[PDB]
Write a protein that binds this ligand. Structure first.
Ligand SMILES: CCCCCCCCCCC(CCCCCCCCCC)(CO[C@@H]1O[C@H](CO)[C@@H](O[C@H]2O[C@H](CO)[C@@H](O)[C@H](O)[C@H]2O)[C@H](O)[C@H]1O)CO[C@@H]1O[C@H](CO)[C@@H](O[C@H]2O[C@H](CO)[C@@H](O)[C@H](O)[C@H]2O)[C@H](O)[C@H]1O
Ligand SMILES: CCCCCCCCCCC(CCCCCCCCCC)(CO[C@@H]1O[C@H](CO)[C@@H](O[C@H]2O[C@H](CO)[C@@H](O)[C@H](O)[C@H]2O)[C@H](O)[C@H]1O)CO[C@@H]1O[C@H](CO)[C@@H](O[C@H]2O[C@H](CO)[C@@H](O)[C@H](O)[C@H]2O)[C@H](O)[C@H]1O
Ligand SMILES: CC(C)CCC[C@@H](C)[C@H]1CC[C@H]2[C@@H]3CC=C4C[C@@H](OC(=O)CCC(=O)O)CC[C@]4(C)[C@H]3CC[C@]12C
Ligand SMILES: CC(C)CCC[C@@H](C)[C@H]1CC[C@H]2[C@@H]3CC=C4C[C@@H](OC(=O)CCC(=O)O)CC[C@]4(C)[C@H]3CC[C@]12C
Ligand SMILES: CC(C)CCC[C@@H](C)[C@H]1CC[C@H]2[C@@H]3CC=C4C[C@@H](OC(=O)CCC(=O)O)CC[C@]4(C)[C@H]3CC[C@]12C
Ligand SMILES: CC(C)CCC[C@@H](C)[C@H]1CC[C@H]2[C@@H]3CC=C4C[C@@H](OC(=O)CCC(=O)O)CC[C@]4(C)[C@H]3CC[C@]12C
Ligand SMILES: [Zn+2]
Ligand SMILES: [Zn+2]
Ligand SMILES: [Zn+2]
Ligand SMILES: [Zn+2]
Ligand SMILES: [Zn+2]
Ligand SMILES: [Zn+2]
Ligand SMILES: [Zn+2]
Ligand SMILES: [Zn+2]
Lengths: 300, 301
């Protein structure tokens, strides 16, 4: 389903770019012809989303990657968030430039028509991506489409203002940069949670719904286990959470009695992919340690 | 010293921005002001590396992150690579626009002076970022960004010389800048693709290139204690820190610890030291310890 939405959006973007080039060649406008090439950024964003979605379905172990490419959509969401942040910074800088030196728009009616067409295309994109793991990439595309829609609304309003008012001509020239600044603020406000979540997923951060202190406290509550060390909890993608710990039991015969208990304790929380390594005999913190232990070759 | 390196580079970037602003104000040319305000891309590129370097020295286990923030350097390298690729694509679009309609600068002399100052700053940056593995990645990203800046400065200096010595006015001189810009973006994309690939692979839990999964599992199954090995997950955290987890089946819990020493030694022969091996003592039974409500969306691989 997601691939169809992305392909339809890509087709719409290409059609709109063709329309903009054609209308520029008819109207002999070089400025909006150059503006038409600015949709290659949205084409690239859609291509990145498509690649991430295509690779996210290879959820099988591979000689190159043991987990499969389940982390592809989260990577694509991070890339799209970074690209959108860069675009927001660039258009904020451009708005500052227009503040410093004002810009006059030529042919308001053609620009208004192109803006209405772009707004309709972006509304179709929003109706494609209104969302009714994989949600990260989809919301990354949705934020870019929403930014495009806001830009289209701004340019339509700007064209209407020049056509209706421009021949107080002084304040009219400054309506575009302030609206662009407001749109940058809104876009960054909506994009920061997505970028934060993606970056915190790529880093091996504990998911926000799991507290390590409580998990450790319940882990020591099992009768067989004596102490828990080297506890690593991280999120692969979506609800795929992997937990790893070392335990001391001092009773290999009843290990399955307490291994199932530890599995149940992990299963009570949103953890189902675990790997618990027992150790049997306190000078050494961990019996199974490397012969030449180095801080540069071990986790944490 | 790495942090002081980035502080020195940031200070030089800021003072060159101030110099560009002053030159714009005295010269009363808006192009210099526009360039000075566009130069903030390097300020953000250095700030990202500084943040990553500061945050990745916290290798201790944190409440929010049990592995520490040692992956922050690789994250910063990836962010710098993506930012550089975006800047390259923007440069390519600008070159296309210049090809469609050319641009002529008003005063070659001021452009030449500003470009010479920027070229000196950038060659100092290269001499400064001349050079663990994760530390190299962030340094590699900033070095590539400074190299792209230096190539841009060389291009602008050469182009300014060409206008000052040739233009009075051939047609080809107006198109000298886009050709050099295209060459620059080609070279910079070629030299930044390996960094982006390496960073993205590291964050995608890719097996390090020096580990063969088939050989590893064949060696693991070769020891006497184990009966079979299933769900062998191997991934690289950052630099030379590789974590490998596996599930094994032993003959009996008695004398299991000898099997664990042998498996640890087998992993230690390869570049893996931070391991975790879960024995599964005794239907097909792929894994004795499995969740009751098995789901493909709630499990690794
Ligand atoms: C942001 C910067 C991203 C940088 C990414 C750099 C990637 C570099 C590696 C590229 C990589 C994908 C890895 C994941 C890519 C990223 C996904 C997420 C992207 C999010 C933005 C290509 O993928 C490979 O090639 C094919 C890809 O479809 C596929 O082929 C299959 O389907 C085909 C269908 O047509 C068709 O031939 C056929 O059915 C199959 O043969 C292979 O199985 C697959 O391994 C993996 O490298 C591969 O590793 C293999 C084992 O060592 C080895 O072969 C090669 O080393 C290399 O090929
Ligand atoms: C470019 C790539 C960088 C990659 C690595 C970046 C790691 C950043 C970690 C920062 C962060 C995670 C949030 C991440 C946001 C997105 C980050 C960027 C994402 C996009 C790339 C954890 O990190 C916190 O940050 C603190 C402030 O820096 C710091 O504490 C220092 O304090 C003194 C300061 O002067 C210093 O004296 C002292 O010694 C340190 O203890 C500690 O590291 C830690 O407490 C901050 O948020 C956390 O949220 C918690 C909620 O309940 C809440 O507690 C806090 O709000 C915060 O704890
Ligand atoms: C397009 C690319 C090249 C750049 C993307 C923007 C970055 C420059 C931004 C995005 C999110 C930012 C981070 C968001 C949150 C924080 C936590 C912040 O921690 C604090 O000190 C918070 C205050 C406190 O705890 O006292 C330090 C800056 C940092 C890492 C920020 C550093 C700058 C970042 C990486
Ligand atoms: C003169 C201005 C227009 C230039 C600088 C613009 C941006 C660099 C700033 C302006 C307001 C900032 C935002 C103000 C508030 C927040 C909320 C906060 O993130 C959250 O969403 C946390 C929860 C919350 O505050 O509701 C911190 C980031 C963010 C988006 C900030 C991101 C950076 C922004 C967009
Ligand atoms: C928004 C921008 C700035 C993001 C960064 C640029 C991306 C558009 C590029 C950077 C690396 C590229 C990837 C590099 C490697 C590959 C592998 C390639 O697959 C193969 O190697 C096929 C081999 C074969 O069988 O012939 C498919 C394209 C892809 C995913 C590329 C897709 C486009 C990517 C993500
Ligand atoms: C207006 C016209 C003249 C513009 C022409 C632009 C091209 C000459 C540029 C644009 C993007 C460049 C590509 C960007 C990224 C890469 C990846 C880089 O890494 C590899 O793929 C390794 C070599 C290989 O595996 O083939 C090789 C160069 C290449 C294909 C570049 C080749 C030259 C390209 C196609
Ligand atoms: Zn867009
Ligand atoms: Zn479970
Ligand atoms: Zn241990
Ligand atoms: Zn550890
Ligand atoms: Zn730079
Ligand atoms: Zn198992
Ligand atoms: Zn070892
Ligand atoms: Zn698995």
């Amino acid at each position: 389903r997601n691939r169809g939405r992305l392909l339809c959006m890509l087709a719409l973007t290409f059609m709109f770019m063709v329309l903009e080039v054609v209308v520029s060649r008819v109207t002999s406008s070089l400025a909006m012809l150059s503006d038409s090439f600015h949709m290659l950024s949205d084409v690239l964003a859609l291509v990145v989303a498509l690649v991430a979605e295509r690779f996210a379905r290879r959820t099988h172990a591979t000689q190159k990657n043991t987990f499969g490419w389940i982390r592809a959509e989260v990577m694509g969401a991070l890339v799209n968030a970074i690209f959108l942040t860069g675009l927001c910074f660039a258009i904020l800088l451009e708005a500052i430039e227009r503040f410093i030196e004002p810009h006059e728009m030529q042919q308001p009616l053609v620009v208004l028509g192109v803006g209405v067409a772009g707004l309709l295309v972006n509304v179709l994109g929003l109706c494609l991506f209104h969302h009714h793991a994989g949600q990260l990439n989809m919301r990354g595309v949705f934020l870019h489409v929403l930014g495009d829609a806001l830009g289209s609304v701004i340019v339509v309003v700007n064209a209407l203002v020049f056509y209706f008012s421009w021949k107080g001509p002084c304040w009219v020239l400054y309506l575009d940069p302030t609206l662009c600044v407001v749109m940058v603020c809104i876009l960054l406000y909506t994009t920061y949670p997505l970028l934060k979540e993606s970056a915190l997923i790529l880093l091996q951060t504990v998911p926000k719904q799991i507290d390590i202190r409580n998990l450790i406290k319940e882990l020591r509550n099992v009768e067989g286990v004596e102490e828990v060390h080297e506890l690593h909890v991280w999120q692969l993608a979506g609800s795929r959470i992997i937990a790893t710990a070392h335990i001391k039991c001092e009773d290999p015969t009843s290990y399955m009695e307490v291994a199932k208990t530890i599995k149940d304790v992990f299963h009570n929380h949103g953890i189902h992919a675990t790997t618990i390594q027992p150790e049997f005999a306190s000078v050494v913190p961990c019996e199974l340690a490397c012969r030449t232990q180095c801080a540069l070759k071990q986790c944490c």
